[PDB]
Amino acid sequence: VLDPTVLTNAITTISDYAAFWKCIASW
Amino acid sequence: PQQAPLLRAFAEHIRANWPQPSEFGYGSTLQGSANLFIPSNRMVYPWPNQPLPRLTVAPTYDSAMSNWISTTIAFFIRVVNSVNMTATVNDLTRRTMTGVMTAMRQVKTMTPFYIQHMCPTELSVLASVTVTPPFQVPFTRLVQN
């Protein structure tokens, strides 16, 4: 599950994904 | 290396950290296979793939994508801290930029682990239940020829 709840809070300290699943399926 | 320091170490980092593409097996050997350019009954994957381990502290950080992430982020901080950068970016922003960039490096993500270990046993099943079997040409990395 692609959840950006950790990457957002890591970079807010210092203040849908279909293009990725298209990239796996095109391998 | 002294006329062009950030550009030599970027042509070297791509040649060293770009993943060696690999291959596995899909489908049943009684069934027959439809691919042409690859082997009759096999697929080809653009990352080195390994079987599924128990998800400890080792296998979720040793992956090729976790090595491609951790050695590109470690390069662009060496770009953002250079002497040619401070024409516009002042000292306070440089620390912030570095802080933001690294914060991309330490974030836990299972998707470097997923592409190596979990996805090839997921792609090989899905390439036998779809109608058109995967047409594929061999992946070649950094080979001029």
């Binding site: 890591a10 | 998800l55 400890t56 502290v57 951790s70 620390r95 690294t102 914060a103 836990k108």
Partner: protein, 434 residues
């Protein structure tokens, strides 16, 4: 020697593959620079004045007197000790639920821990953190920042600055000598010796038809177990638990360890994981061959919670509807606790019914058992565990010296403690502060 970056790590940079990368990629840089007006600096430096007859050591003792009035300074010391004990107890409890993460000793390593994901270690570290915030009720969030990256499996702190010449000063901050982590390692090491006090049980599980009429003791089985994995003519079920149905007149067969189909009526070693994904095939095929006295399975759960159902041996009891309930509530999620049926030990010699029992454990798990009748002259029929004097050597043992026990093996209910009677003063109650 210009200090370009001052950096603080949250994660040990050597267990992730990061021993050779630079400091700006391993640790997190601080990025703060508040601007100052020089015209406010130049004025305030060039025209500051004071009192005329200013004796400054008098002026500071006049001023710094109401800042050392009590425990203002000594609250940070009490906060620092709890942030050291809760940090090791988070580092221990995370790295004991993984296959050898840190040198941390692992005494209850025998208990099965499958999920070792970073999401799973985040729930272990958060509940260790919620225990220290509940017991000590400290409101400020301690160690609620090592899970900022996602994993507390590599939770180790380190701080470092980096001058321009690359001369990185990098010194670690390891946690000090703990004390709760020393005490939590003795509760764990005693836990394996007697987990029956906490309703956990060692050993496996046997499902054989036992049509007994006399005494039955499921938790403390007399003599040896019927068979053990790897014995003569004992087969282990394969990881699917599948059954190949044979046609007109033959019997259906389990698929054992390997690919060979072996027939059901015999002996079987069912691992606990296979029974979580084959209960609809267990209860349909092999479990009737358990009821008819043909096969005998060994549901080898490693450790399990149990549940006792005491009953009257005067009246009959079939243990099959209690086992059929237990085989129905088994999901791939988790199993319900094992239901053993132990007869209530009777005072008088009785005429007991012929009862059909199935589940009885392998390793002796009847430890949390106190005397059967503590208010009767003698237990006639049932098992008669009298009050065992090994747990009470401070009361009945003659060559017992005050001060000893047997802590990593048993619990001694009658010991000789020290009862302190301290008085806790304030800082005003020791020195004179005026």
């Amino acid at each position: 020697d210009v200090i370009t970056n001052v950096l603080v790590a949250r994660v040990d940079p050597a267990q992730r593959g990061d021993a050779a990368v630079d400091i700006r990629a391993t640790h997190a840089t601080f990025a703060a620079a508040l601007p100052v007006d020089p015209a406010a600096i130049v004025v305030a430096m060039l025209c500051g004045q004071t009192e005329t007859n200013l004796i400054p050591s008098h002026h500071y003792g006049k001023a710094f007197a109401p800042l050392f009035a009590s425990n203002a300074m000594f609250t940070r010391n009490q906060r620092a000790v709890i942030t050291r004990e809760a940090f090791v107890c988070a580092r221990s409890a995370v790295a004991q639920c993984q296959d050898a993460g840190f040198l941390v000793p692992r005494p209850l390593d025998a208990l099965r821990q499958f999920d070792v994901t970073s999401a799973a270690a985040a729930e272990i570290m958060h509940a260790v953190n919620d225990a220290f915030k509940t017991a000590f009720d400290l409101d400020g969030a301690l160690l609620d920042g090592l899970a900022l990256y996602g994993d507390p499996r590599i939770a180790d702190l380190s701080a470092a600055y980096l001058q321009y010449g690359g001369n990185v000063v990098r010194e670690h901050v390891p946690p000090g000598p703990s004390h709760i982590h020393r005490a939590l390692q003795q509760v764990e090491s005693t836990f394996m010796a007697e987990m029956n006090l906490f309703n956990v049980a060692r050993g496996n599980l046997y499902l054989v038809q036992t049509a007994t009429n006399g005494n039955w003791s499921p938790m403390a089985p007399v003599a040896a177990p019927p068979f053990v994995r790897g014995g003569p003519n004992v087969r282990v079920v394969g990881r699917f638990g599948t059954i190949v149905p044979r046609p007109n007149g033959l019997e259906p067969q389990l698929i054992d360890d390997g690919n060979v189909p072996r027939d059901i009526a015999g002996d079987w070693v069912y691992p606990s994981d296979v029974l979580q994904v084959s209960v609809a095939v267990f209860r349909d095929y092999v479990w009737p061959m358990v009821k008819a006295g043909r096969t005998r399975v060994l549901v080898e759960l490693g450790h399990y919670v149990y549940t006792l159902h005491y009953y009257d041996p005067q009246i009959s009891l079939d243990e099959a509807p209690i086992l059929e309930e237990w085989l129905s509530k088994i999901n791939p999620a988790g199993i319900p606790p094992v239901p053993f049926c132990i007869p209530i030990p009777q005072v008088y010699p009785c005429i007991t019914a012929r009862r059909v029992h199935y589940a009885f454990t392998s390793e002796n798990n009847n430890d949390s058992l106190f005397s059967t009748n503590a208010a009767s002259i003698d237990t006639a029929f049932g098992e008669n565990a009298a009050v065992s004097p090994l747990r009470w050597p401070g009361l009945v043992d003659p060559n017992y010296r005050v001060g000893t026990n047997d802590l990593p093996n048993r619990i001694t209910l009658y010991n000789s403690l020290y009862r302190y009677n301290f008085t806790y003063p304030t800082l005003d109650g020791i020195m004179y502060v005026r």
